[PDB]
Design goal:
It is classed as transferase. This protein is of the alpha/beta class and about 270 residues long. Helix content is about 40%, strand content about 15%. It contains 11 helices and 8 strands. A hairpin with a 4-residue loop joins strand 1 and strand 2. The two termini are about 25 Å apart.
Length: about 270
């Protein structure tokens, strides 16, 4: 496989971002990583045969590397206690800096692409499509946080971020009362997804979540939030979504891969049809 490892400068973050890349077409699938994103390889390449599966699909595959606990968002400030010496600006990187570089150097189109995320980045994918519909007419969320601003979720997200590299949610979107939480909440932004006619693919798993509170309680919160998202999408006039909630589905790389393979024909028909 002609997979490449690229160094893409980020002016906003003052550093080079590593990007794993496979060509094959002018439009691309952006494969976003989970909460514990490493700085050597994207979790999709560590854990799955994603590149091989999308080889000769007519689509390029882009795996950005890095951004542990970043939610692929633009942060207010550096995370303080873990000594971060810059501000995460991953929305700026994914929507401006990286597509400009890929267009200029490889001819990858900055528009007409798919954003696919899991766990942490499931919501990210939907938010990117909500605010950048020309770039992302297609978004998939696999076990994402679909209502991060509501109820228990700001607390649980804060705990998860702290457990993953010691990152501080307050530095990201402020206290949960800050407008940034609702801005970046897929549930709240459903009217944008509907207005944009975004093609959304939403996978909900079962069992062990992806805090020191009982698993069954977490599972109940997750189930309720997922059902509310699906109901709200329909009630707000959404008509371009795929909602997958198989009983045997899990919150894990094998099933996130299963979903990535399952959506390939869907992405091909939306982006290249």
């Amino acid at each position: 496989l002609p997979v490449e490892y690229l160094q893409v400068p980020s002016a906003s973050m003052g550093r080079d971002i590593k990007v794993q890349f496979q060509g094959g077409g002018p439009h691309a699938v952006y494969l976003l990583d989970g909460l514990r994103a490493q700085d050597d390889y994207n979790g999709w390449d560590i854990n799955t045969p994603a590149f091989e599966e999308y080889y000769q699909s007519g689509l390029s595959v882009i795996m950005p590397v890095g951004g542990q606990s970043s939610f692929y968002t633009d942060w207010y400030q550096p995370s303080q206690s873990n000594g971060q010496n810059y501000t995460y600006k991953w929305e700026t990187f994914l929507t401006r800096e990286m597509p400009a570089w890929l267009q200029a150097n490889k001819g990858v189109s900055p528009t007409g692409n798919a954003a696919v995320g899991l766990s942490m980045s499931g919501g990210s994918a939907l938010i990117l499509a909500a605010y950048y519909p020309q770039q992302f007419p297609y978004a998939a969320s696999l076990s994402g946080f679909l209502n991060p601003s509501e109820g228990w979720w700001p607390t649980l997200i804060g705990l998860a971020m702290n457990d993953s590299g010691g990152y501080n949610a307050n530095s990201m979107w402020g206290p949960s009362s800050d407008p940034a939480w609702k801005r970046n909440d897929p549930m709240v932004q459903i009217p944008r997804l509907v207005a944009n006619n975004t093609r959304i693919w939403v996978y909900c798993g079962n069992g062990t979540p992806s805090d020191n509170i009982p698993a069954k309680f977490l599972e109940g919160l997750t189930l309720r939030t997922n059902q509310t998202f699906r109901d709200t999408y329909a009630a707000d006039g959404g008509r371009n979504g795929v909602f997958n909630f198989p009983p045997n589905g899990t919150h894990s790389w094998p099933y996130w891969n299963e979903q990535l393979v399952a959506m390939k024909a869907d992405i091909q028909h939306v982006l290249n049809g």
